[PDB]
Structure formats: structure tokens, C-alpha cells
Symmetry: D3
Subunit: 281 residues, 6 copies
């Protein structure tokens, strides 16, 4: 019972996503399509990477990940299809559901979208998608998200051999983007968690415990060099005490974050991604 998890920049105000799904079913009958998100900022590769990087451990083995923002649609560019190694705490009841390696496939424009996927998970082999068996002989130039991602993803869900979609790629041929690094820790606001107004940073758990920082530690987190927040590190929001109170926590992705307890922190003060972050103890 095959699954395609589908992430795109196609939006939710027209038939575009539905066209893709129609084909997915046409090709892989009995397929279940799980919508990740279709609301991402178009062409914002680094935003899209964030929505797909942590998915594998939550999905059954065999799940195909169709992930696409395709600003170079209609060009010589071709999509890349990749079987990752490690799905990567396990998710689920009990001690979790351990996922076998080489058990997930990403297919995506070769435009950097998979950058964090490949490094957090690794990959066995990557292939350029060119065979007319998994893509159209005459692709609609403007709709590669359908022609060069959705359509072949469904072939791959129906058991089509990855190694036959086209030629094999070298690591150097796989486009990557580059994240700002983390340097007293300096970082950046990665995202606002809608609809809660929570604030996410690029500082990982692993960066804290490397500076002698664990739960309960009193910290200062400064935004934009003008907003000096102060609070103890806590596992969750309610630990901040009263409603509205600032909380400092590690989010479900393993990253230092701020919020208010049952109140929005970002929205009322128009705090957005990009603001810079300084962490002190």
C-alpha cells in the first residue's frame, strides 16, 4: 500500500495539486498521497528543505517523497531521485518504530532543495530523471513540478527501479545551498511557527550541550540586537509559569526556540525570520 508524501509551492487556490494527484493515482493505483505542505514561499529552496528534512522516520518504509519548487521549470535542468541511507530517537509508541536504511526515496528538482536531506540522512545513489518511462516525452515547460516530480514519484511508488530513471549522478553534480553556521552562541531566526507565533533558531541541542547547557539553565536570548529575553531553559511552554510568560525551549526538531505560554510572541510585534540571535548564560 504505497505512499507519496507531497510537498510543493503550488498553493491551495487552484487545481494544480489535484492534477498531480490525479496522475499519481493513475500511475500507482491504490496509492495514498499525504500532503505535507503546499503553502511554502515559492522558489525559497531553504524553506522547502525545512519541511521535508525530518519526515522519513514518521512514514512507513517505502514512502516516496515528492518535493518540489521548480523556478527553473522548462529548462535543461532535470530532477534528481535519491535513495537515502539513514531515516534517523525513533518516532511512535513505545521506544518507537525503527526504520531500515535505504528505505526512502526523494525526488526533486536538482536545485538545492534536498541539501539538508542528503547531509542529515546521507544517500546511497542519485540519478538524473530523464527516461520517458517516468516522465513525459513532451513536458509542459512551465509545469515540471508535475512532469518531472509528481509523475515519476508515482512510478517509483509503483516499484519502478530507481537506477533506470536516468544516468547516475556524482556528488558534485548535486546542487547544494549553504546554511549560515553557528558560532556565547550566535545564530539566526530560521522560522516563525504558525499559527502559534513561536520563534525558531538555527542553534541545535548539540550546540548547547557543547557549551555546558542543559535543562533549567538560565539563559539570555537577544533578537536583532535589541530584544534581550531572559528565561530558564525548559522542556515545554507551560513551564514558564503564567500565560503570556516567555519560554525558552528545544522544539520537536531539536532547536533552541522562544515563545509565550498560550500566547503569540512573534505576531503582535511583527517578529520575522532573519532576525539575528545571541545566546548567553
Amino acid at each position: 500500500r504505497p505512499i507519496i508524501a507531497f510537498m510543493s509551492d503550488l498553493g491551495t487556490t487552484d487545481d494544480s495539486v489535484a492534477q498531480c494527484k490525479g496522475l499519481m493515482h493513475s500511475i500507482c493505483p491504490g496509492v495514498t498521497v499525504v500532503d505535507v505542505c503546499h503553502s511554502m514561499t515559492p522558489w525559497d529552496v531553504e524553506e522547502g528543505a525545512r519541511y521535508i528534512v525530518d519526515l522519513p522516520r514518521f512514514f512507513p518504509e517505502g514512502t516516496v517523497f515528492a518535493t518540489t519548487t521548480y523556478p527553473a521549470t522548462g529548462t535543461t535542468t532535470r530532477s534528481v531521485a535519491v535513495r537515502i541511507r539513514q531515516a534517523a530517537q525513533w518516532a511512535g509508541s513505545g521506544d518507537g518504530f525503527e526504520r531500515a536504511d535505504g528505505s526512502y526515496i526523494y525526488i526533486a528538482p536538482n536545485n538545492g532543495l534536498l541539501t539538508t536531506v542528503l547531509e542529515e540522512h546521507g544517500y546511497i545513489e542519485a540519478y538524473e530523471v530523464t527516461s520517458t518511462k517516468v516522465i513525459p516525452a513532451n513536458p509542459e515547460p512551465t509545469f515540471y513540478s508535475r512532469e518531472m516530480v509528481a509523475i515519476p514519484s508515482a512510478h517509483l511508488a509503483a516499484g519502478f527501479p530507481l537506477a533506470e530513471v536516468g544516468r547516475r549522478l556524482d556528488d558534485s553534480e548535486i546542487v547544494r545551498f549553504h546554511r549560515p553556521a553557528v558560532e556565547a552562541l550566535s545564530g539566526v531566526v530560521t522560522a516563525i511557527d504558525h499559527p502559534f507565533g513561536n520563534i525558531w533558531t538555527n542553534i541545535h541541542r548539540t550546540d548547547l550541550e557543547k557549551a555546558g547547557i542543559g535543562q533549567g539553565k538560565h539563559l539570555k536570548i537577544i533578537l536583532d540586537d535589541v530584544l534581550p529575553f531572559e528565561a530558564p531553559l525548559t522542556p515545554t511552554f507551560a513551564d514558564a509559569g503564567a500565560i503570556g510568560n516567555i519560554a525558552f525551549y528545544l522544539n520537536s526538531r531539536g532547536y533552541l526556540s522562544l515563545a509565550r505560554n498560550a500566547a503569540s510572541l512573534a505576531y503582535p510585534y511583527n517578529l520575522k525570520a532573519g532576525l539575528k540571535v545571541r545566546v548567553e548564560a
Copy 2:
């Protein structure tokens, strides 16, 4: 062929809902997940209750209702799992599809979310959700909507015995919220029906016929003590005559409501929930 109807405050701008669905499928293969809404105002329990209270009669028997806003995520709080009694006019073709009792299960934070569910439908037994068989041994503090609702809901859809998720609860142990009552009838605007701009009140059919009010009766409905609307009670919008004309009707949930015929009433004049309502004849 199990169904999970899923309602949350997780939104539609990231991978959160997808993570949950991935697990649901992992646990209950062949499960179909029906999205109710994920756009509710976070932490607004009474808004979430409104989206889930009328669902059972529309769904096949055996449907599990996973409904969650979890501001106390990461705390001692635990979710409650409940088998309701009456699913409650029947919905469907002909005279409708009669639903057997004890045929639906709700699982939700024990924070008042199910208040109207339990009173409109009743319940056979309620249980605290604690067994590591339906929830993780080490839950992510900030994501109880996944760990303590989504994950066990899928076990319950796969046939896991309700009585084994944890200890049985007493009625007093089930958190409830309290609605403003209805008192010439006085009430309150409960919701604006997007995207139509229709206005919903807490005055039920049953409150009208208890004051000698049936179809065709000329009424006055005043909002905020400054907007005196006048119209006959009618079954639907077009009965108001011309487009734009005010209509007074009972909505599909059985509640007195106002609108314009093929025009928005609320949006142009920024009429929101909370406004108070006076009904006269």
C-alpha cells in the same frame, strides 16, 4: 477500512500534520485520514469543540476522532479517550443512515475540548491515555498533539481496546468548559461562517419553538445593541428575495443565523464573534 477524522490547531504551513499522518498510517496500515480542519485559533478550546461536535452521524461506524489543541503539552496532563453513546435527523440519502450507539471514539487532551461532544452525545466510558503501547515511552514535550492524540488514535483505529490505554476516569475528572446560556431571546454571536460572512448565534431551533417561533415569523435580530435587523424567518438565503437582502435562518447545525443572499454580511462591516444578540418578534 478504518477512518481517522483529524482536527487540530497545527495549521497548514509546515510538516506537523504530515508527521502525525505518517505515524497514523505506520500504525494502522490502510487507514484513511479525513482532515476536518487545522486552521482553528490555537488554544481556543470552545472553537475546536464546535468543529467536532456534529461529526459522528456523517462518518462510518468505527471512525476515531482525533481532536487536539494542546497548550498544556509537555505537562502531567494526559489525553482522554472516550466512546460516546448516541451519534444523533439522520444524515445521508433517503431517510438517512442510522448509526449504532457506542460506535465512535474521541481522543483528545483532557482540557475541555470534548465538553459539548460528551453532553450532546453522552459517553459510555472515559480513560486516561498512559500505556506505552499507544503512546511513546519518551514523548516530545512540545508535541503532545502527535504523541498523545495522533499516535494512540491510530492504535484505536487498528482495533486496540479502549479500556487498556490507561485508567478509567470519573466524570468529575473530565475537564469541562461552560457556555454562555440563552435567556424575547438573548444570546451571542458564536462564529462567522467563512468565506460567506454569515453570522451564527447560540440560539437553537429548540429555543425558538419554545417561544412560539416557527418559519415565516417576522423577527428582529439586534447585534451589539446597535444593529437592528428585520426579516422573516426562512429556510434558506434566496428566500430573502433579491441579492444582498438580509436573511434570517436556521443553519445546518440548528442555530439561528443571519446572512445576505449571495453577499457577505460580516466582512464589509467587520462583524465578528462575541457580539451580543437580541431576538424579538
Copy 3:
């Protein structure tokens, strides 16, 4: 394995769509419901027609199309159910998936919604939907999108004979709307493609090649008689050269369109549908 593609004006902020889906499953167990869009402007028939007109070739044969905006809900009006002729370049891998005729069914309010469907595709026979076997004996006046579209659509997906839903209609009895025609070509902006900000016009490929216009031709496209854009006709966005540069192209629906390469054209300058269009060479 039956499919219902579902398009409505019911929105995504309440349980309405879910109620419908619940019934669909109740009636046609094992049915897969593919959401097209539920965000259309309510009562805007011509907008809804645009989201459903190009679907058939993307879906498996047998797919039932449940498409509904129902401002005359609760009136004498009844829905129309139609088996189209031609599904209509084929979509998919290779040379595409050829679709047999008479292989798709639309069901919809008889209010003009299907106007472009029937003319672009044709139809074998149309029927008024009245039988209490596919609709309720006592319909909720305000919710015909559920009672007179969703419910019977699921019967039709479960194999119920189209000719038995009610009486057969004459062409004249099928409500239609009328599009502005295309006249140096004059036309109109049909839609803004969210979230990209691309601009769509009513000028078809077929209108260009009828004026000696093919790829590479230098054109001028004027909006609102005040915005004289100039660019060569190109297959896709990146052909415009640098990012931000204007591109003139045929979209995936076969219509002259404008945009910027990896930049929004409409949003920053508040360009909306309705603006008039003049095309020169």
C-alpha cells in the same frame, strides 16, 4: 477503487468539507476523495468552472467530479449530473494516458458551473438529480452542496446508474454563463496564479497562431491601457534571462500569460483579474 475529485466554495475553516467526505465514504466505502480546491470565491461560478474544466485527462477513468457553489441552495433548483464525451496532448509519462470517452461524470448545481466543461468536453446525457436514492428525502435547505452534490456523487462513484438519478434534461434546460470573447488581439485578465503572481489571459494558443504568432515572436502586452509590457514569446519563465525580468508565455492550460522570472509580477503592484489586455506584434 473509485475516486471523487471534490471542488467547492465551502472553505477550509470548519467541518463542512469533512461532513461531506464522511458521507462519501459512508456511501462508497474504499472511495478516495481528491481535494481540488475549496478556497474559490463563493458564488463566483466562472471562477469555479476554471478549476474543474481541465481535470478529466489527469484522473483515472471512472472518476466522479463533485463540483459545487450553491447560492440557490434550499430552492426548487436541482443539481445536474452529466457524463461527458471527450476527456481531451494526453497527460502522463511517455506520450501520455489516453482516456476513453464517456468515462467521467460531473455532478453540480445547474447554475452555469459546468458551462466550460460541457463545451470543451461535450456530453452524452444530462439528468436532474431528484431520486431519494441519491439525495435525502428531507434536505437541509442551506447545505445543498452536501445534500445535492456530495451525497449523490458518492452513489455515482459506487456504480449507481446515472440515468436513474432523475429525469433527463434538454440542452436548453442546462444553465450556462457567457464568457467575454476575444477579438491585434484584445482580451481580459482571467486570473492571478497564486502564489507566484503570474497573470493569465483569455487569449488561447489557438488565437495566436491564427494571427501568425509562434514562439520567439516579439510581442507587446498592455494591461488596463496603461502598462505596455514588451517581451518575446517563450516556452517558460527562465527564458526571460535574469531574475525579475518579464516573461511572455503560454501557461499549462494553453493561454497567453505574463510573469516575472522567479519574482511576483501581480502582487507588488496590486494587479488583479478583470484588467483588460491588448496584444501586439
Copy 4:
């Protein structure tokens, strides 16, 4: 002690008005320039009319009114200068300042701006402003508000003869506009939102009311835009609505039926703007 009362659409965000004022002082030294308003909606002649039609009784005899919105600036269109007749119950302390006839001059573009001035005050002699003694020989094309209104207004204030500004006009040569009508239950329109209070003015006059048997203390239903309803008695002032926030129907200082909330804004919360239909039923 010459006075020019200055109304324009030039705004409050550049030196336009100040250029004009500098010339007024240049031409007429010792002049006092009283700002009427400079924030009117651009080119909205009927809106400007309301800001200048009630002025004369509040001002000293001989005051010159310089009133301009000049969308046809740079064309053959010229300004007109007019001695009005009646200053029209007086304003001021006691029983008020009695104003003699023919004591005020309006100078404006001949584009209808004065339609209502002439209608309520009548006039005596109107002249086209063409003389290079009171306007520039080579006027800046975009700045006729200055060239054809401000400058000449100052010569007039200095005592320059009205009859010498140019040729005398006939009534048919004075461009006029048509007020929105009141139909008769009364139907009219919202003429203006009174900022910053959010009060709502209609074109419905006291005389239309008393002509439909509607007097003080009486209950009306007013509907805006064919759907938004309000009910209240006709009262003299806002506080008569009782509680803060309550709805009030009154006659404004200009004689027109108006709607408001008491020490709160009615227009803004419902996004009400000029132009909406008004239906009044008793």
C-alpha cells in the same frame, strides 16, 4: 487688516501652500492668511464646496475667500471672482455678528467649486480672471491654484478692483454641478465622513425632514448601503444618545441629518465611507 481665507487640495506634505502664502504676503503686506483646509480629497469639487459654503458669517466683512482644486490646471480654464450677496441667524456672542450684503469675495477655478456658495448666498457680479495685473503673464502650467487663485486673491485683498480682473460673466458662464438628490420615507446619500470623530453626514437637509413631518425627539430607522440598519430618535446633540457608544441621529451645524456614536466613532468600525446610499424611514 486684510484677510484671505485659503482652502485648497495642495496638502500638508510639501511647500506648495507656503509658496502661495509667500506671494500673498508679497502682494498684500500685513495680510493675514487663515487656513481653512488643505486636506480635501483631490479634485473632489463637491467636497470642497462644503468646506467653503458656510464661511462668510464667521469672517469679517471684506474677507477674500481663495478656494481651489484645479485638475484642469494648464488649460484654457480660468478662475472666476465673485462678490456674493447674502452672508447667510448670526454667529458669535450674544445674538451674533450681523454681516452686510456684498461683503465677501470668492475667487476660484470656474469648475463648479462655487456651485453651492452661489446658491445659498446668491451673487452680484462675477468676473473672469484674465488680467496680467492680477495673474502671471506666463503661468506655470501645473500650478494654477497659485497662478490663478492665490496671486489674484492677494491683489483683491489689497483693494485691487474686482471689475478689472477681466470680463464680466453671465450666470450661464459659471460652471455648476448637480447636488445628489433626495428622493421621497426619504432616500439620500452619505456626503462625508466627519473626521476624526467618525460622524456621518448625509445630503438630507432639515427642510426635507420637516417636509416629511419629522421633528425633534422622534424615532427614525436609517439604513446605509441598503443593509446596515440603525434606529434612534432625532436629538440635538451626541450625549442625547445616553451611554457612550450609543447611536445618535442629529442635525449638524450645517443643517443636515447626521449619524454618530456618542464619544465614539461610528464610521471606522464598519468601514463606512462617503457615497453610500441612505434610506430614512419613519
Copy 5:
């Protein structure tokens, strides 16, 4: 050389203020009307108070202050006219203009508008304005700002006797309001956003500071609305924050602790408005 300083809530988008000015000139010829502000939030008495409480030392002796927001217009409510005592370190060049006592008159609605004028300047004689020699016999009900403030202000400016405007009041007859308190770590509130700069004024006075041992050059943490934090030393001016955009804590020209960014706006980016709680901790 009579002068009336005019503060109202009448706005900048109609002829209201100009009607008032025309009468001032009518009643007191040669008067100069100095606009203070006309854009205050409607009916917000405590906001108006701040725009008129610091004025006297900047103005010539004998200047009359006409200050009005009149939400009770058309009622029994009357205006009060007051000769203040102390003009209160002087403003102007050198060591400043020394202002004699009892040299300024305020006329306003008796609705508390003058609460802070009387508190900081004290007063000598206050009178109720009822005489038909300085107000109209039949006042327009909606326009008391004109009928009961503007008109009488002009007679006063012309030298009309203060004691003759009506009966003399006692302190208990002068309506007053209560300032938002400062609790004591200090807690107060934002009183105003200083446009167009986006600076933020608090009700916390220099004296509250020096009373908590807080002086120049010292580090404070200020929290707005119980969550939005800022840290900086107390400095005399904006540039002392260093780089453009940096946060500054200072005492404004009125003596109140304030927050700002240096040549950049603090309020607008975070949508900060008057009314927010302020917590200052050292």
C-alpha cells in the same frame, strides 16, 4: 499684540477650525492665532492635557490658551476660564524668558482637560463662562468648542474682564481626572507615542527616577506590555545610543522617562501604542 494659542480635537479635514478663527479675528482684530495642535485623539482629555501643560513659558505674558475637546457639547456642561499662577528654569536664549505670575489665561470645557495645568502652575481665580457677552445666547448644540471656547477666548484676548464671564468657581467645582499612577523597580504605563519619530513616552517622571536612585549613564531594563524587553543606559539624547537604530532611554523635554531608537522609529515596527504597561527594573 493679543495672542490666542488654540488646541482642539476638531481636526485638519474641514472648516471647523477656520470658523473658529474667523470669529476670533472678528471679535479681537489684530489677534494672532497660534495653532498648538488640532489632531489630538478625539475626547481623550488626558492626551490634550499634555499638549497644553508646558506652553506658558514659551508664550508672551497675557497670551490666552483656548483648549478644547467637548464630547458633552450641547449639554449643561459649561467652560471654565482660569488665570494660572506660575508659568513653570526658563525657555529662550541666554538664561531664558522670565514669566511673571498670573500672566496666562486658560479657557476650556470643565471636563478635566486642565487637571494638569492647574496642578503644575496652580491658579488664582477660576470662573464659569455663562455671560452672553462672551458666549452666544443660542449656542449651536454640537459646536461648543466654538461657542464656549473659541468665541469667549477672543473677548478675553481683547481685554474683556475675566471676572465678568460668569460666577467664580471653587476648587471642588473644577472637574479633574486622575493621572495613571507609578507603582514602586517601577511600574507605569506608556502615555503617548511621539509622532512621527516613534518615540515612546511614559508616565514615569524624573522625580520617580531620582527617588529610586536612578541617575544619568545608568543601566535599566524596560519591559513593555509584560513581555517586550529593552536594555540601555539612561542618557540625555538619542545619539548617545551610538549606532543608528540602537535603543535609547532618556528624559524627554517634559521630564518623563522615554524610549526610542536613534534616527529610527521604535514604536511602529513593534506596533507599540499608548496604554501598554511599563516595567522599569535596575
Copy 6:
């Protein structure tokens, strides 16, 4: 009959400007203060420059221009006072008011505000304002617009000697800014949106045009922000665009190429703001 023309960034929503005016009257009795503008964008020196560079020819000889935006208030930064040379075809009726040389004084912060005044009018003697005879001995740190501009402007208007305000400056001591350049097809920038009409001013001058062989009645293509295109002939005024709403390219009263719609706003509908690139091609 002394006159001070007053331009500041102080705004229209408090008593700041009125404090300043009170002192002007205090120091120079009988002075007339002409408001230029007080609504300029805060700290935007080049925007202020445009509101004060065209003024002298419209004003009487001897008028003092008090022009200030003072982001460095409270520092060592001082103001400068300057007698300009050329008042620069005259404004006014007939062939206009001929203005003698050296007849205007500007006083402003030495922060570049006068860059364009000095460039177009030249100057004769510029002085640093330091004397405690024309400024305060203990200036309020946040209010230099008042302490270092308003107060001294008044002494100057009263006839106080310019050379005595402080030491004489050299050209190199007068801070200046750089105008946005015009590159050459011409590329420039939008300098301002002309409110409330929504007209669009560019930095492209008449001389840049006639230097590229571009004259009246000729077709141009103008592109804003590298993507938004407009086409029209160069005409003298808005109506020359024909129909209401139509696009017009013209030279404004200041000599700069500008874009507009005829009796309709161009900027607002497309959200166009100052700063956008402008490309003009013929």
C-alpha cells in the same frame, strides 16, 4: 513686517511647533510665522532640501528661513546661518517679483539640509550659531530644532546681526550631501511621491532631458523599479493626457521629469514609493 518661514520634521500631533512659535513671537513681536511644512519624513535631509530650495522668490526680501531636522540633537553639532546670494524668471503677477541678491537668510542644522539651497542660490557669508545671545546657555538636549533653529531664527528676524551669531565658516565646514546621480537612455530614481495626488517626481532634470534631445510633445517609455512600464509623450500639464486616468509625463514646477495620471492617482494603486529606479528611454 518680519517673516519667518518654518520647515521642520516635528509633526502635527503635539505642541512642539507651537513652543517654537511662542518663542518666535516672544523674541520678535509682530513677526509672522509662515508654515512651510512640518510633515517631512523624519531625519530625511534630502527630502527636506526639496521643501526649502524653491522658496526665496515667493517670499519678501529679508524673510528668514528656519529649516530643521535634527537627528544629532544634543551633540556638538551646531546650526549654521547663511545669507544666500541669488533668489533663483520671477514668480507673481505680470512678469513677477524681482528679488535682490543677498536678501534671504537660512538657518539650519549643519547636517547637509542646505546642500541644494547653497548649490542653486550660492551664498555669501555662512556662520556657526554659538552665541548665547541667540541660543540658550543650557539647551534642552532633545530639542535643538527649537534651541538652535527656532530661537536664533527669531533674533535674526528681529534684526540681530548675522555675523555675530558666531564664527564664520568656510565652504569645507558646511556639511553637504550627494544628490542621487543621473546616468546616461537615462537612468535616475524617484525622489518623491507628491501627496495627495499620487504624482511621481524623479531626480531627472529638464537639462538632462534637453541634453538627450528630448523635448515637448515627444514619446518616452519610462520604467520604474526595472519592470513597471509606462508610455506617453512629454507634455506641459496633466490634462494633456486626454482622458481622466490616462498617464502623463511632464516637468513639474521645479524642473524635474514627473509621472502622473490625469485627475487620478498613479502612485497609490501600484504602491509606488520614493527610491525606485527610473529608466527613461526614447
